[PDB]
């Protein structure tokens, strides 16, 4: 029902390309070894970072809200903390890619109620083809690998593939097979004072991070094996507090009682050899920019070569005109409840910038 973006231009040429957006779940930045966590929770992404120069790891990206649909309404559209309702009145990322001539796909391991009017159902239905892999629980994110490959074989020249993961969502133990609890009973690098149940939950979160590492690295590896022209962006919708913050008694997500570990997120960009060769771009000076996921659509636009009325290059984290703005958190529907993420304590801790 919304009109297309005005003065729409695509400067990325007309060669076929495949662009991938991997939406993880409840994965914070501070529990991945890729970001300095002393437990080896992400070995495959670490090795990929060591061996592949086209993997760009962003170190200072946070989400704006710690609830899935509440953040995705901002990340996937032009809405943000100051204007949270723009997802109703302006196009989404998927709409934008359709206007650019892409065939769009939604692959998900999250239980979607297709017969019901949920906001996630609407977003996934904004694409040309959907793969609902979890419609009924032990359904692991590797479920997405088979349809992903299938979509890679789809003959459309320009393709957008969205992969929605369960990631490290509660309950953590159910995110990975029972025989893959590498950190079960381990007490190294554990905060003090946990009881048996809290300790088991902590180690469960690290195990879920291990499996999520395997899944994301597998997506990148299979994508690369297709020898594609394009790139893949991986981000988590939000983090998750798992006894990280002193006094180490809190587990979960609470917007009105925020901690940094609820808001820090991984943010990775893998660029294929063909795309890097055809679209030369240096990201090495962008990796430490302080950025909020709420403006993702501009970064994506920048990466896709798209410009239009409403495009803001200064809010793209890969743009030379990038200008840091306040990384707002807090409920945007309460009266003047927005606060600067930087004001939260314990910002000096590893992975908690
Ligand atoms: Na937005």
From Swiss-Prot:
GO BP term (any one): lipopolysaccharide core region biosynthetic process
Annotated source species: Escherichia coli (strain K12)
Main location: membrane
Keyword annotations of the record: Cell inner membrane, Cell membrane, Lipid biosynthesis, Lipid metabolism, Lipopolysaccharide biosynthesis, Membrane, Transferase, Transmembrane, Transmembrane helix
Function: Catalyzes the addition of a phosphoethanolamine moiety to the outer membrane lipopolysaccharide core.
Enzyme's top EC category: transferase
S-S bonds: none
Topology versus the membrane: Multi-pass membrane protein
Pathway(s): Bacterial outer membrane biogenesis; LPS core biosynthesis
MF terms in GO: phosphotransferase activity, phosphate group as acceptor
UniProt family annotation: Belongs to the phosphoethanolamine transferase family. EptC/CptA subfamily.
Coiled-coil stretches: none
Name assigned to this protein: Phosphoethanolamine transferase EptC
EC number: 2.7.-.-
Oligomeric form and interacting partners: Forms a complex with an unidentified protein of approximately 36 kDa.
Subcellular location: Cell inner membrane
GO cellular component, one term: plasma membrane
């Amino acid at each position: 029902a919304l009109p297309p973006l005005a003065n729409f231009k695509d400067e990325s040429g007309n060669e076929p390309r495949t662009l991938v957006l991997v939406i993880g779940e409840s994965t914070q930045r501070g529990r991945m070894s890729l970001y300095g966590y002393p437990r080896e929770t992400t070995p495959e992404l670490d090795a990929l970072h060591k061996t592949d120069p086209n993997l760009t790891v962003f170190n200072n990206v946070v989400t704006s809200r710690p609830y899935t649909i509440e953040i995705l309404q901002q990340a996937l559209t032009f809405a943000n903390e100051k204007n949270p309702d723009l997802y109703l009145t302006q196009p989404s990322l998927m709409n934008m890619m359709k206007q650019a001539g892409y065939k769009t796909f939604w692959i998900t391991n999250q239980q979607t109620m297709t017969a019901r009017n949920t906001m996630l159902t609407v977003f996934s239905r904004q694409t040309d083809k959907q793969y609902y892999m979890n419609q009924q629980a032990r359904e692991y994110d590797t479920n997405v690998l088979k349809p992903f490959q299938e979509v890679l074989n789809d003959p459309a020249p320009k393709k957008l593939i969205i992969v929605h993961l369960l990631g490290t969502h509660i309950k953590y133990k159910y995110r990975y097979p029972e025989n893959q609890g590498k950190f079960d009973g381990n007490t190294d690098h554990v905060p003090p004072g946990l009881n048996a149940e809290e300790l088991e939950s902590y180690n469960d979160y690290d195990n879920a991070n291990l499996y999520n590492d395997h899944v994301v690295a597998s997506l990148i590896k299979d994508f690369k094996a297709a020898n594609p022209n394009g790139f893949l962006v991986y981000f988590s919708d939000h983090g998750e507090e798992v006894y990280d913050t002193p006094p180490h008694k809190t587990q979960g997500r609470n917007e009105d009682n925020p901690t940094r570990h609820m808001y820090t997120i991984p943010f990775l960009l893998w660029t294929s050899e063909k795309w890097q060769a055809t679209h030369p771009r240096d990201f090495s000076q962008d990796v430490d920019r302080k950025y909020s996921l709420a403006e993702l659509i501009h970064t994506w636009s920048d990466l896709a070569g798209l410009s239009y009325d409403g495009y803001d290059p200064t809010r793209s984290v890969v743009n030379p005109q990038f200008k840091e703005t306040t990384r707002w958190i807090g409920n945007p529907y309460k009266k003047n409840a927005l606060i600067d993420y930087d004001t939260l304590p314990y910002g000096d801790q590893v992975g908690n910038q």
